Design an enzyme around this catalytic site. Structure first.
Site, PDB file in Angstrom:
ATOM      1  CB  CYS A 251      -0.966   0.013   1.172  1.00  0.00           C
ATOM      2  SG  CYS A 251      -1.816   1.558   1.282  1.00  0.00           S
TER       3      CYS A 251
ATOM      4  NE  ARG B  24       2.213   0.762   3.611  1.00  0.00           N
ATOM      5  CZ  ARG B  24       3.378   0.145   3.744  1.00  0.00           C
ATOM      6  NH1 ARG B  24       3.708  -0.399   4.903  1.00  0.00           N
ATOM      7  NH2 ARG B  24       4.189   0.032   2.702  1.00  0.00           N
TER       8      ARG B  24
ATOM      9  CD1 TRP C 247      -7.015   8.967  -2.526  1.00  0.00           C
ATOM     10  CD2 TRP C 247      -8.188   9.282  -0.652  1.00  0.00           C
ATOM     11  NE1 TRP C 247      -6.188   9.563  -1.611  1.00  0.00           N
ATOM     12  CE2 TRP C 247      -6.881   9.766  -0.449  1.00  0.00           C
ATOM     13  CE3 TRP C 247      -9.116   9.372   0.395  1.00  0.00           C
ATOM     14  CZ2 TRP C 247      -6.465  10.331   0.762  1.00  0.00           C
ATOM     15  CZ3 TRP C 247      -8.707   9.934   1.603  1.00  0.00           C
ATOM     16  CH2 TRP C 247      -7.386  10.407   1.774  1.00  0.00           C
TER      17      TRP C 247
ATOM     18  CD  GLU D  29      -5.281   1.986  -7.646  1.00  0.00           C
ATOM     19  OE1 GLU D  29      -5.463   0.759  -7.482  1.00  0.00           O
ATOM     20  OE2 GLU D  29      -5.662   2.844  -6.823  1.00  0.00           O
TER      21      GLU D  29
HETATM   22  C1  HEM Z   1      -6.428   6.647   1.461  1.00  0.00           C
HETATM   23  C2  HEM Z   1      -6.138   6.198   0.187  1.00  0.00           C
HETATM   24  C3  HEM Z   1      -5.471   5.032  -0.217  1.00  0.00           C
HETATM   25  C4  HEM Z   1      -4.781   4.948  -1.383  1.00  0.00           C
HETATM   26  C5  HEM Z   1      -4.573   6.077  -2.378  1.00  0.00           C
HETATM   27  C6  HEM Z   1      -4.300   3.605  -1.498  1.00  0.00           C
HETATM   28  C7  HEM Z   1      -3.744   3.092  -2.654  1.00  0.00           C
HETATM   29  C8  HEM Z   1      -3.420   1.750  -2.898  1.00  0.00           C
HETATM   30  C9  HEM Z   1      -2.889   1.227  -4.148  1.00  0.00           C
HETATM   31  C10 HEM Z   1      -2.550   2.010  -5.425  1.00  0.00           C
HETATM   32  C11 HEM Z   1      -2.696  -0.094  -3.935  1.00  0.00           C
HETATM   33  C12 HEM Z   1      -2.270  -1.109  -4.959  1.00  0.00           C
HETATM   34  C13 HEM Z   1      -3.497  -1.695  -5.636  1.00  0.00           C
HETATM   35  C14 HEM Z   1      -3.127  -2.757  -6.644  1.00  0.00           C
HETATM   36  O1  HEM Z   1      -2.518  -2.409  -7.673  1.00  0.00           O
HETATM   37  O2  HEM Z   1      -3.424  -3.942  -6.398  1.00  0.00           O
HETATM   38  C15 HEM Z   1      -3.083  -0.396  -2.587  1.00  0.00           C
HETATM   39  C16 HEM Z   1      -3.002  -1.659  -2.000  1.00  0.00           C
HETATM   40  C17 HEM Z   1      -3.416  -1.996  -0.719  1.00  0.00           C
HETATM   41  N1  HEM Z   1      -3.968  -1.107   0.178  1.00  0.00           N
HETATM   42 FE1  HEM Z   1      -4.098   0.928  -0.043  1.00  0.00          FE
HETATM   43  N2  HEM Z   1      -4.644   2.849  -0.408  1.00  0.00           N
HETATM   44  C18 HEM Z   1      -5.396   3.671   0.369  1.00  0.00           C
HETATM   45  C19 HEM Z   1      -6.093   3.209   1.468  1.00  0.00           C
HETATM   46  C20 HEM Z   1      -6.080   1.935   2.015  1.00  0.00           C
HETATM   47  C21 HEM Z   1      -6.845   1.544   3.162  1.00  0.00           C
HETATM   48  C22 HEM Z   1      -7.893   2.447   3.800  1.00  0.00           C
HETATM   49  C23 HEM Z   1      -6.465   0.267   3.461  1.00  0.00           C
HETATM   50  C24 HEM Z   1      -6.886  -0.622   4.440  1.00  0.00           C
HETATM   51  C25 HEM Z   1      -7.515  -0.311   5.641  1.00  0.00           C
HETATM   52  C26 HEM Z   1      -5.494  -0.080   2.457  1.00  0.00           C
HETATM   53  C27 HEM Z   1      -4.993  -1.361   2.319  1.00  0.00           C
HETATM   54  C28 HEM Z   1      -4.281  -1.843   1.256  1.00  0.00           C
HETATM   55  C29 HEM Z   1      -3.903  -3.231   1.054  1.00  0.00           C
HETATM   56  C30 HEM Z   1      -4.014  -4.391   2.024  1.00  0.00           C
HETATM   57  C31 HEM Z   1      -3.390  -3.320  -0.175  1.00  0.00           C
HETATM   58  C32 HEM Z   1      -2.952  -4.581  -0.888  1.00  0.00           C
HETATM   59  C33 HEM Z   1      -4.081  -5.156  -1.722  1.00  0.00           C
HETATM   60  C34 HEM Z   1      -3.633  -6.290  -2.614  1.00  0.00           C
HETATM   61  O3  HEM Z   1      -2.502  -6.782  -2.446  1.00  0.00           O
HETATM   62  O4  HEM Z   1      -4.406  -6.690  -3.505  1.00  0.00           O
HETATM   63  N3  HEM Z   1      -5.286   0.933   1.589  1.00  0.00           N
HETATM   64  N4  HEM Z   1      -3.553   0.735  -1.969  1.00  0.00           N
END
Ligand code: HEM
Ligand code: HEM
Ligand SMILES: CCCCCCCCO[C@@H]1O[C@H](CO)[C@@H](O)[C@H](O)[C@H]1O
Ligand SMILES: CCCCCCCCO[C@@H]1O[C@H](CO)[C@@H](O)[C@H](O)[C@H]1O
Ligand SMILES: C[C@H](O)[C@H](O)C1=Nc2c(nc(N)[nH]c2=O)NC1
Ligand SMILES: C[C@H](O)[C@H](O)C1=Nc2c(nc(N)[nH]c2=O)NC1
Lengths: 413, 413
Positions: free
Chosen positions: B110, B113, B282, B287
């Site tokens: 992520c 973070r 968001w 993406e």
């Molecule tokens: C506030 C805005 C946030 C942005 C801009 C963001 C953005 C991203 C992006 C670009 C990825 C990669 C997605 C992919 O290509 O598979 C990602 C993965 C991830 N995010 Fe975030 N994130 C945010 C919030 C969160 C929140 C709120 C959580 C959890 C409470 C979180 C948990 C994760 C997890 C676990 C992954 C891995 C998912 C996977 O491996 O398929 N993210 N996030």
């Protein structure tokens, strides 16, 4: 038994069996110890040498279409006797040629591996002085450059004996620009070569304080102190950077050398180690256009180009950086072509590597690959390599990294 | 003791000590088993549960500025008694809130973070039917969407008891478009959702054969067969794609949903497992602009856009692909802004993450990070993250992947 890898682009599946022949996640680390073959002060223990030598001889003969068991057994015996009577052994020209190509074929970070079989090998194993090293390197540079029609080549210097008489090129690359800390505080030239530039200065070289001063060859022969040698200018082919549309691009006064040559790696083959074996191929556009010209820690011309294009260089979301780096990449490619100097764009290189990977699994059940290194510095997912699952492992022969020579060298005077 | 990582951009060095608290190179593999927490048919063995529970309770209380040892000891005792008398235990609302944020803080893939502390938590641990799950999800979608002003949120469904009564969302994401194999052989909509679309059809859902049909929620409650639920259209906010300069862009008829929500992951905390905990943040421009619109295995609009721009779509070296994907990225960002829908470009996101990483090492001596996942799909080395050395490791709490539910589910009828 086998490991399965998926190509999320085409959906194709491949079965990896080659990894069986190999020797927190630290895959992001630049030069890890696992890929570094350091110095020695004693010959390679015979327990280790013989088995590795036998393994390589078997590999050598096993690679022929028409098996030659008669000559194979004879070679196994002769190598054994040589190690038995001398403590080491000499490879035949053909074995060395084979080793250099296989080592290339085994380089996980190389995207140009489809060319593995086209490699000129210069045998400099009889070399003995720094002056002689210099002559070999010059001949290499000249052959490889070929006035723009780049040819892949490698020069093999004497193998390590006891580790006290190593042949080494202190340079990272054969051709590289100097970096100078100026009186006014600004940095001139390649900011990444500051320390090494100073070393050359300490050794006698005269600083020319320009933006593109070709550094001298710092050569170490037979374990003795390194000697400086200016590369003869006629041998260094350069390309002046021009843009096909922006006339103001040439006003930037940029240029780059045409020859990409790794100078400091170690060739491991059948228990033997060649601490000095510079090699070259041809450039991939993004190396110059993106890394050399756009890294903040290098020439850092991104903001200047953006402003010249009249972009919102003050607003990241405008994606001015994406628009700028592309015109620079285009400039490089356009320039190398206009001046008839071999070069390949990253898209074509990527497709080329995918084809190679396919040939490798088909031929030997695998292809050691480093995703982090193979995926281009721009337009990652636009290239097929990004969607290809890869396995990274160390085979043999192999090209290892070495500890910086100035860190372990014992000066004579 | 500590592992050192270098930031080749700024030259800065960091010392990692956090990796000590963790649990051929296969780092390129999409969903490795090491990150997958599968099904069970028996409760978690007490030998494993108690220690993990104690460890988490200690972590919970150790995170307070003003230590509360009085309440800490009391909690340790109560949890022990609960596990002793029931075979498991219930987290307090505050503990769960803490767990969801820490798990987010611990997500190596992520890039958003830095927002870890801003997270709305919906406690649905008292849920029992598929209809109730549906209601919670709708409330979540509505809260999170907030008419364009996106808010991060997570909904926690009942924890796994014996593994026979798991709550599960069969969907990969909360909002996703369907993919249809048409009569004429062509694929309509999201080619990546062909199989799952068919499943929804097999379960009763009616195919609308459009390019952007929002798939239904396939909900599994208390271990029973999954039930289909159409997402109420008013809840699905979309953005029509327009380019700030090319009027012909809107003629492409493209659009995308505004809410990025992971629906199928498992939340592990203190020995407990929550198989159903959808969460959202968001979108990051690339993406949609790069993966969704430019992957060959998805909407694959790259060539169409290139030809519309009048580019040499027949010559790779022209870098038409680089020029095209950028205008598409610009379109997405421009569209989300014009329609007042939260979104962040990749450059700003990257800088944001670097700042976060810095805060994390400063605060706890580390930041688990997956380079392959963190580096944007375009303009890799133009972003600071590319030059940052990273360490990837699994901490706790953590968000794991799960085996596809349709692969291990035992149907009732
Ligand atoms: C506030 C805005 C946030 C942005 C801009 C963001 C953005 C991203 C992006 C670009 C990825 C990669 C997605 C992919 O290509 O598979 C990602 C993965 C991830 N995010 Fe975030 N994130 C945010 C919030 C969160 C929140 C709120 C959580 C959890 C409470 C979180 C948990 C994760 C997890 C676990 C992954 C891995 C998912 C996977 O491996 O398929 N993210 N996030
Ligand atoms: C024919 C054209 C060739 C092309 C276009 C090509 C291109 C490249 C590129 C782009 C890299 C990554 C450079 C970096 O970012 O550090 C690389 C690495 C490498 N190549 Fe090739 N290559 C070619 C030929 C060769 C040859 C002839 C050899 C050896 C006989 C070779 C051996 C390697 C090795 C060992 C590395 C890793 C170097 C390192 O880790 O610093 N390549 N090559
Ligand atoms: C002590 C080490 C003994 C090694 C036994 C080697 C036997 C010869 O090995 C043979 O070499 C041929 C190449 O000419 C290959 O084509 C054969 O497949 C291979 O079995
Ligand atoms: C069987 C397990 C026994 C665990 C002993 C826990 C002792 C209490 O642990 C204390 O908790 C405080 C938070 O209130 C922290 O601030 C203290 O640093 C920590 O030592
Ligand atoms: C930190 C990270 O290992 C470093 O930025 C990497 N450098 C390079 C890379 N890939 C190549 N080809 N060359 C590099 O120098 N990938 C990333
Ligand atoms: C094969 C490789 O693991 C795959 O292409 C990857 N996918 C993704 C990635 N990074 C992110 N953020 N998301 C992905 O889906 N890096 C590469």
């Amino acid at each position: 038994q086998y490991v399965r890898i998926k190509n999320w682009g085409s959906g194709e599946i491949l079965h990896d069996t080659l990894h069986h022949k190999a020797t927190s996640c630290l895959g992001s680390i630049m030069n890890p110890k696992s890929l570094t073959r350091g110095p020695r002060d004693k010959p390679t223990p015979l327990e280790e040498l013989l088995p590795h030598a036998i393994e390589f001889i078997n590999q050598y003969y096993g690679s022929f279409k028409e098996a030659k068991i008669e000559e194979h057994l004879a070679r196994l015996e002769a190598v054994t006797k040589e190690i038995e009577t001398t403590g080491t052994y000499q490879l035949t020209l053909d074995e060395l040629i084979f080793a250099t190509k296989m080592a290339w074929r085994n380089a996980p970070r190389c995207i140009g591996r489809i060319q593995w079989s086209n490699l000129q090998v210069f045998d400099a194993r009889n070399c003995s002085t720094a002056q002689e090293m210099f002559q070999h390197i010059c001949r290499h540079i000249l052959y490889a450059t070929n006035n723009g029609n780049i040819r892949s080549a490698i020069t093999v210097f004497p193998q390590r004996s006891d580790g006290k008489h190593d042949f080494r090129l202190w340079n990272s690359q054969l051709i590289r620009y100097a970096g100078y800390q100026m009186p006014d505080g600004t940095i001139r030239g390649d900011a990444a070569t500051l320390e090494f530039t100073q070393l050359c200065i300490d050794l006698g070289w005269k600083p020319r304080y320009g933006r593109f001063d070709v550094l001298p060859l710092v050569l170490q022969a037979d374990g003795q102190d390194p000697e400086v040698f200016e590369i003869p200018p006629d041998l260094v082919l350069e390309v002046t950077m021009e843009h096909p549309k922006y006339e103001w691009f040439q006003e930037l006064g940029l240029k780059w050398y045409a020859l990409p040559a790794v100078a400091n790696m170690l060739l491991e083959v059948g228990g033997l180690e060649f601490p000095a074996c510079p090699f070259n191929g041809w450039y991939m556009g993004t190396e110059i256009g993106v890394r050399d010209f756009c890294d903040t820690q290098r020439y850092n011309i991104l903001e200047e180009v953006g402003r010249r294009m009249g972009l919102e260089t003050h607003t990241l979301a405008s994606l001015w950086k994406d628009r700028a780096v592309t015109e620079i990449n285009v400039a490089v490619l356009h320039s190398f072509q206009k001046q008839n100097v071999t070069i390949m764009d990253h898209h074509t290189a990527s497709e080329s590597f995918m084809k190679h990977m396919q040939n490798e699994y088909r031929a030997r059940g695998g292809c050691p690959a480093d995703w982090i290194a193979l995926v281009p510095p721009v337009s990652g997912s636009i290239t097929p390599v990004f969607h290809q699952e890869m396995l990274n492992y160390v085979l043999s022969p192999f090209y290892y990294y070495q500890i910086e020579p100035w860190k372990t060298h014992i000066w004579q005077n």
